[PDB]
């Protein structure tokens, strides 16, 4: 429920952030 | 705002600036959601620390920070200072950022094992000791 | 468009993979 | 399968095996779903390349490959081979993986700039030339 949904939203945003930085520092 | 930032780091794509700006906005939004979790939630401490450690590993945070520190310290400039020609200039390998752009573009520069010819390549903290000349 | 749902899933699955790999190659560093 | 991978590579928890196994299944599911986009879709091409480049950068893939190769080349063991003790053994820095585990846990090993004391640390391709004694 609400706590799991709050957690899933944070996990998707952080994973997307990791992905964005990874593309900028890779060949 | 941009043109000054783009000027001081010799960035020619206006689009590089907008990506960094959205990343600063991403980090802000992520810290805001983390701070809105219950303080009794162990997920909050853990993912706040994940975000901090990640920004250390990128060299975007050069000093010990709390989540509240992120508004001040996480700026487009802090990301720009990670670009390979700005790093090269700070290491004294190039007299100017513009000379470093040329060295990079012409294939003279290696980070870790890889030839890097893109001046937008961001140097992480793991890699910042391993910028070398191909020659 | 019609590919939006399938694109958006792939985007999310890949960003999750990148995060999973990133964690396994991570250190504990704190600057001064 | 879990017990044998752990023995070959001297992994002491049961969970690293499942982390790697889920990751292998993530990669397979991702490659299957990419193949269902139209062949001319630039998004598919971009994301297949990104995925290949990531597995190269991890060293998980050691040879030039395509998405159709992922089924075979992306195994739990291919991930296990990236663990610092296994890497040290392959570099001949330790006579055995168990020796490497001890060197690592006792603080004798650096990867790039960092002291690494966790034998579960994965060495990316970027880092593998920079395993040094302390």
Residue numbers in the entry:
A (entry chain U): 428 to 454
B (entry chain A): 28 to 162
C (entry chain V): 428 to 459
D (entry chain B): 28 to 161
Article, verbatim:
The 5' region of pre-rRNA that consists of the 5' external transcribed spacer (5' ETS), 18S rRNA and the internal transcribed spacer 1 (ITS1) is co-transcriptionally packed into a terminal ball of ~40 nm in size. These particles represent the earliest assembly intermediates of 40S and are known as the 90S pre-ribosome or the SSU processome. Within 90S, the pre-rRNA is cleaved at sites A0 and A1 in the 5' ETS and site A2 in the ITS1, yielding a 20S pre-rRNA intermediate. The fully assembled 90S contains an unprocessed pre-18S rRNA, U3 snoRNA, approximately 51 assembly factors and 18 r-proteins with a molecular mass of 5.0 megadaltons.
The EM densities were docked with the available crystal structures of yeast 40S ribosome and AFs or homology models of AFs. Imp3 and Imp4, bound to Mpp10, are buried inside the structure. The H6 helix is extensively bound by Imp3, unassigned α-helices, Krr1 and the WD domain of Utp7. Imp3 also contacts the WD domain of Utp1 and a few surrounding unassigned α-helices that extend to Krr1.
